[PDB]
């Protein structure tokens, strides 16, 4: 069982053109309710979204908290900013998803044999800092920029046990699936 399933739902990443992106859910948001179902863990949101879709619910309420950073002078005593939203329940039978991802850092958990990843020499346990000069925090950010790199060389910066190495790669199409891939496994 994955570890994030018990942690609170703090949005680490939102996919574009998804239900969550179009509705305005941003990274750092914390989902606390949907219809109903109280949401304290990622497991709750997953099970609630499955039952809602199977029950035929197409629209429902989604309560969300948006906080962080240093308080503004005079506004330190303000109550938490809660957001009442009307979400479009993703059709779980058709494979739809809400479009939000947890906060897991891009630490590699495995490298495929012969795949263009040992090509340059990236090892498991490596922490992917940034990609192409783009500061990232989650693994889904790096997968975003493999398929829109359109075969061009991508530059990545990796921290290994203390030292920060720089490694580039260029792999693209594949005959089996038909998409771009690099050859890295999340932990």
């Amino acid at each position, epitope marked *: 069982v994955p570890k994030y399933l018990k942690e609170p739902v703090v949005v680490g990443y939102v996919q574009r053109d998804s239900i969550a992106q179009k509705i*305005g859910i941003k990274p750092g948001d914390k989902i606390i309710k949907i219809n109903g179902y109280e949401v304290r863990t990622w497991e709750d949101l997953r099970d609630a979204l499955i039952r809602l879709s199977l029950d035929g619910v197409k629209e429902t309420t989604l309560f969300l908290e*948006r906080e962080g950073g240093v308080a*503004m002078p005079g506004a330190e*005593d303000d*109550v938490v900013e809660v957001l009442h939203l009307t979400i479009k329940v993703p059709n779980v039978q058709k494979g739809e998803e809400l479009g939000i991802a947890p906060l897991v850092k891009p630490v590699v958990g495995g490298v495929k044999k012969g795949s263009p990843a040992d090509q340059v020499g990236i090892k498991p346990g490596d922490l992917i800092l940034e990609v192409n000069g783009k500061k990232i925090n989650t693994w889904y950010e790096l997968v975003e920029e493999v398929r829109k790199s359109q075969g061009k060389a991508i530059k990545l910066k990796i921290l290994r046990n203390g030292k920060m190495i720089e490694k580039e790669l260029i792999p693209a199409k594949d005959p089996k699936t038909g998409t771009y891939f690099i050859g890295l496994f999340p932990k």
Partner: antibody
Amino acid sequence: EVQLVESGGGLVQPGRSLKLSCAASGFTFSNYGMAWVRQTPTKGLEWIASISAGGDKTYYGDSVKGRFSISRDNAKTTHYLQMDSLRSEDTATYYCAKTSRVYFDYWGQGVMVTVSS
Amino acid sequence: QFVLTQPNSVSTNLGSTVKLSCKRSTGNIGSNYVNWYQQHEGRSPTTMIYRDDKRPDGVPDRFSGSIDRSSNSALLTINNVQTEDEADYFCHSYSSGIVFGGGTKLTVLG
């Protein structure tokens, strides 16, 4: 909807006092801090005062030298701005504003204050 | 503590893309949130962008804010600039006190 409407402006002779009001409605007043931001065509938006949600803490801008006193009455959902020792350089449009942790989420309509003899 | 410097005026054409800059004098841009306010002629300011890039309900998606800690400058971007976008724009931040920018009068021609 959140509504903030100012009142208590007008004209004052240089050196006398005025008390601005800001009636709030459409939200839990005591849950949020209020503030006052004035505007001149020469300087633009300038922060003046700010009071915490409970009314315990107060923060003042640089242009006020202990002259202005911001308070609030959570029973009537209204906060006030006492303005003593007014000079001609205080002639501006005065907005009250509601805060949401890190910014002003809603502004009032603004009230004009003219300091002249 | 610090000030925010905006271009006093920026002229762009209808349908183009304007980038309104807000440079922080001293201190790191990311240590405090940057908020953008639109003020039409003779009207009260409304919120266009809060918490660096969050857009309130009602504001068109043509508006988007961003943070650039390299230049310590915040940018308010307006795609497909309309006639109703012609107004004043004040960036805003805070620390020990509360700081406003000088304001940028966005003129739009065409």
